[PDB]
Structure 1
Amino acid sequence: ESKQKIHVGPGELDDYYGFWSGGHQGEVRVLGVPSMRELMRIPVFNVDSATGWGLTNESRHIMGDSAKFLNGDCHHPHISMTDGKYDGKYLFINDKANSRVARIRLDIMKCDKMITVPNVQAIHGLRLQKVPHTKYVFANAEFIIPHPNDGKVFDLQDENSYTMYNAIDAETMEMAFQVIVDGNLDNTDADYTGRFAAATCYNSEKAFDLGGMMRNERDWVVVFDIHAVEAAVKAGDFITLGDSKTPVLDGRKKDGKDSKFTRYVPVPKNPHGCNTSSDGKYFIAAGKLSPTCSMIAIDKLPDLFAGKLADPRDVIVGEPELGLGPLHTTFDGRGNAYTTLFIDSQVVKWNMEEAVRAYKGEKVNYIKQKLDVHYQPGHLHASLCETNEADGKWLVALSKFSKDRFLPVGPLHPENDQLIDISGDEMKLVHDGPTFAEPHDCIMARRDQIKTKKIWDRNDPFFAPTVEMAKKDGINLDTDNKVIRDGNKVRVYMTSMAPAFGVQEFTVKQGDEVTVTITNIDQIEDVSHGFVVVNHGVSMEISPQQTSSITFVADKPGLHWYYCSWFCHALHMEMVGRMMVEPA
């Protein structure tokens, strides 16, 4: 029976962490499951007024040149793995809007690295190497562009117009390699060995019109032999593009002939999801325009890459007919797959091995249950489904139209992320969770897979550059309350300890570029401070033992108040200071 409790009462804790994509809003959200309450927001591609992410020097340093963008579009959150199990170190996420990948450190729940993927447009599909560990982050660039894209050629049928599959080194967050592909790229997953990855393609037609993109009854799943790519990179057998030293391998077909890096497995039709079963047997492609999933036997891939198979379709071992609009698939670890039907507006539960038998002509009932969802589901996620610990307890289906499921709030509606108990034979819908801005996908982890810090380490790399700047000024950040003058630059350093800033007044000249660096020397957990300069667009958080810094121009003469924004003490309202700006 499906019977688990969803209520988490006052004083009780959730059993799992949920990491939600922020969708078009650009952040990552931490939820407790099964309460479905949002515990934290982690700013990534958004600018966050509260913490100052996007304003502070530390955050802008992480974002690099891309700190000029105030937007992102996130879809695909994934947690780093060791030996096919979550290791709790990192969360990675895409940015479709400005072509980035970000890394979040799960001990501090902050974005700590970010990369603009070179020579591509729109980072969509993203998933992680599972075994031996997450060495690579694999990311799809969705859109075909010219190379170079310098405005001389615009034609997407040109021989140098393409997109690429991308591998980022997880630990360094520098590029590892790129593989040029035929067609385009939608979603991606990885096997349980480290050798193989796979991605769906919906535009095998290389067409730039809606209808053109649906002409072929089959596109493909493209499979990558990562070992062969790695070998070619070691041999120096690669080109580079634009200004990037990233190794670029060519995985396109040449006059019908396969490269060593890729195989193209025909699959109907504009397929979307690409999901690796938790037993490691299958890459399962969701058929979208075709009312099917296609099951690729991972076991057969070495033979495919060796030329031992007559036809690339020989790796397909199942093509179950499921219903209208299949988009994404997940796993209970009991041998069932669960697939979203966008058009039928359901989740379909189906037995994978039976579908494989059906494909060989046995008459079997692989469909177990169809559950109505509300409405038009996209992704779905079962607890621990990306790991060999898939536990079959909870499932979340993320549906794009909520219609009448919540109180009306105007023309813009929330998404409906529905919690489903899958612990028994029958799926049961237990909670409707409204969410903002279209999280597309989410990922769950056991409470015991995530270990967080209670207060910051003074040596944390997040603010290491600030610590270096201080050293150059002769400043001991744990103690000093000083104003350094450097031409028209002023560098204010202070400690803070509730309810007092360590520097409560300073004076500068109109036009000076002021940097304020604050170290919160409280040691009690949860005593955060803030810093806001009135009417100057200046806001940041400083948590216990953190150093944070922010730069602004003092372009207004007169007296300008600053205050602590984070309620920190009974005397919080009085935790203030004054900047005096002498007229030009």
Structure 2
Amino acid sequence: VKESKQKIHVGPGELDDYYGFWSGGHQGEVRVLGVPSMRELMRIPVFNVDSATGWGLTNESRHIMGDSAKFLNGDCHHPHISMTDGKYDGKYLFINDKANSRVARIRLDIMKCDKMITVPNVQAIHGLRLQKVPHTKYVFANAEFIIPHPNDGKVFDLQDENSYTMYNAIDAETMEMAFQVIVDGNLDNTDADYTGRFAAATCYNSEKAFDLGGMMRNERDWVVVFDIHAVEAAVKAGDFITLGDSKTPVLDGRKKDGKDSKFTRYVPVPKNPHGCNTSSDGKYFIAAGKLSPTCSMIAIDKLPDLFAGKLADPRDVIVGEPELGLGPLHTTFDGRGNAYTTLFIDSQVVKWNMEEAVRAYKGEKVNYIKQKLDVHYQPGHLHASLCETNEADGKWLVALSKFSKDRFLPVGPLHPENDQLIDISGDEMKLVHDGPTFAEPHDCIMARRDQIKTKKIWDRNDPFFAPTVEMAKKDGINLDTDNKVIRDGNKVRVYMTSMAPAFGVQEFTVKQGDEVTVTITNIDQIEDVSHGFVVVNHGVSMEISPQQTSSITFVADKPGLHWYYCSWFCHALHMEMVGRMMVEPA
């Protein structure tokens, strides 16, 4: 007998116990919450354009985004923290972009997106998870949609032999592509084991159809399992192809005339399975059945035998398939032997014992279902604290539901999502908080307070703005001290320091049509004294936090006097922290 009775109120002056990193869904950002208060502490722009910080407007951010800076949107579902020996190391957060086919990396010491990649020769990055062991060497990412190769407009048929999608591995540290694996069917969600050898992904479109009925035709789709050791061996030996103008090694993981690839095995699983979740004891890949009212449990310790050809049937790695309820979508773990699964249709979270499900599969009469909790309403992902690590602590559970209906004040035709906090510390789940959120977070991830270490002020050598420091070097500029205007034909480069309540350059004059770059170094050393920079009626806006250098480029297309001001309230004389751009007529 142990009861669920954790404190939920975080009063003035008290601090949260966990960080929560919420995906922003089709709003495109990442949100940092405090747990258990469920208050949003910070927003990290990633695929959105952020008016406040200038992400998407500044030269530093557009350099990280590359050519994809032309997009103003993203759709990000699956945030994950890098690991060392199967435990969070607090270094990086990665997330997908389903809308423009990207993966982004966030540095958790500065809480900024510091790298972004457009995955080549695919459409729509959905599923994303990280290698756990020995550490996060690879980010694994699913491309969801089957497309022609090449996609040059000659062939549109998804049944053609060169229409397919690929599993993607990105080098976590360099954020360059490592390899791609062609698969049969498509790819939904993915997870990795606790050794580094295996990863797995659900497939819902084994039919390679484009219509709803066609995509639901097969009694079973599959989870495809990847022998990452085998893939690495083939890349190391150089036997791969490349596609288009991308140098990424491409390996063929499709079945050929019934014959298995070295790189993959296809484990039949009902039906349009969705979630793909590694148990924290590392025993199971658990696929949520969605259209089937089940989960399927793949025994990871049978996968070597499967790939060695020792097993008569790929279904032999299935060791449990418990019946849970209508519309299972995702599963998480308390570290105590229980799994917790969302039932989208029944609108519940079901708590069940994994080892008892395995014994039921053998035909033992044993009830593995422990409890069903109503949630509100239609849950998608759920996440228990540290569930993606061998330190899963069984304390907090968030169920992220898609219809809030009557749970909050009405706010028009568009409704918030309902992310509900559930106490799982004891024998019974207890619903303790309804958290409304914008734009459909899909998944979230929690970390202990002590697993995240952040900078209080920027380092002057930070790679985030090192290209800008390089530009300054070519102009002979010492960013820490200089207040100067460089003139270069019709280009103008303003460099200034800033120190509340004054910009270091408070007026400058240019010619109508000049392309103006303004670089600002915040030389305040007091924590929290951020500055801003807005040029009135020019669409220019950006953050400069303590010891940061930030820069932005715009064309002075309007003759006359044009004011600029500090947007970050920074001092009693904030309103007076202004300057003038004077534009001489053409």
TM range (shorter): over 0.9
1:5-51 CA-partner distances (Å, limit 9, x unpaired): 00000000000000000000000000000000000000000000000
Partner SS state of residue 228, structure 1: helix
Q: Take 2:181 and 2:578, find their aligned partners in 1: how far apart are those partners?
A: 55
Partner SS state of residue 113, structure 1: strand
1:88-138 CA-partner distances (Å, limit 9, x unpaired): 000000000000000000000000000000000000000000000000000
Q: Which of 422, 425, 436 is equivalent to 1:434?
A: 436
1:279-325 CA-partner distances (Å, limit 9, x unpaired): 00000000000000000000000000000000000000000000000
Partner SS state of residue 247, structure 2: coil
Partner SS state of residue 468, structure 1: helix
Identity %: 100
Q: Take 2:122 and 2:244, find their aligned partners in 1: how far apart are those partners?
A: 10
- TM-score w.r.t. length of structure 2: 1.00
1:313-360 CA-partner distances (Å, limit 9, x unpaired): 000000000000000000000000000000000000000000000000
Partner SS state of residue 407, structure 1: coil
Partner SS state of residue 299, structure 1: helix
Partner SS state of residue 23, structure 1: coil
TM-superposed deviation, 1:452: 0.1
TM-superposed deviation, 1:59: 0.1
Q: Take 1:312 and 1:79, find their aligned partners in 2: how far apart are those partners?
A: 31
1:142-176 CA-partner distances (Å, limit 9, x unpaired): 00000000001111100000000000000000000
Gaps of 5+ in 2: none
Q: Take 1:17 and 1:115, find their aligned partners in 2: how far apart are those partners?
A: 26
Counterpart of 2:7? 5
Q: Take 1:529 and 1:208, find their aligned partners in 2: how far apart are those partners?
A: 50
Q: Take 1:108 and 1:65, find their aligned partners in 2: how far apart are those partners?
A: 24
TM-superposed deviation, 1:439: 0.1
Q: Take 2:308 and 2:543, find their aligned partners in 1: how far apart are those partners?
A: 56
1:375-402 CA-partner distances (Å, limit 9, x unpaired): 0000000000000000000000000000
TM-superposed deviation, 1:259: 0.5
1:39-92 CA-partner distances (Å, limit 9, x unpaired): 000000000000000000000000000000000000000000000000000000
Q: Take 1:30 and 1:493, find their aligned partners in 2: how far apart are those partners?
A: 33
- TM-score w.r.t. length of structure 1: 1.00
Q: Take 1:164 and 1:108, find their aligned partners in 2: how far apart are those partners?
A: 32
Q: Take 2:436 and 2:108, find their aligned partners in 1: how far apart are those partners?
A: 25
Q: Take 1:259 and 1:532, find their aligned partners in 2: how far apart are those partners?
A: 57
1:236-269 CA-partner distances (Å, limit 9, x unpaired): 1000011110000000000000010000000000
Q: Take 2:516 and 2:454, find their aligned partners in 1: how far apart are those partners?
A: 33
Q: Take 1:120 and 1:554, find their aligned partners in 2: how far apart are those partners?
A: 39
Gaps of 5+ in 1: none
Q: Take 1:242 and 1:551, find their aligned partners in 2: how far apart are those partners?
A: 34
Q: Take 2:563 and 2:215, find their aligned partners in 1: how far apart are those partners?
A: 58
Q: Which of 329, 332, 336 is equivalent to 1:330?
A: 332
Matched length? 584
Counterpart of 1:18? 20
Q: Take 1:42 and 1:506, find their aligned partners in 2: how far apart are those partners?
A: 32
Q: Take 2:269 and 2:528, find their aligned partners in 1: how far apart are those partners?
A: 52
Q: Take 1:259 and 1:47, find their aligned partners in 2: how far apart are those partners?
A: 43
Counterpart of 1:425? 427
Which 4+ stretches in 1 moved above 6 angstroms? none
Partner SS state of residue 64, structure 1: helix
Q: Take 2:309 and 2:268, find their aligned partners in 1: how far apart are those partners?
A: 16
RMSD over aligned Cα atoms: 0.2
Partner SS state of residue 133, structure 2: coil
Q: Take 1:20 and 1:199, find their aligned partners in 2: how far apart are those partners?
A: 22
1:190-243 CA-partner distances (Å, limit 9, x unpaired): 000000000000000111110000001100000000000000000110000111
TM-superposed deviation, 1:275: 0.1
Counterpart of 2:86? 84
Partner SS state of residue 495, structure 1: strand
TM-superposed deviation, 1:553: 0.3
Instruction: Report 1:143-542 matches (<5 A).
Output: 143-542=145-544
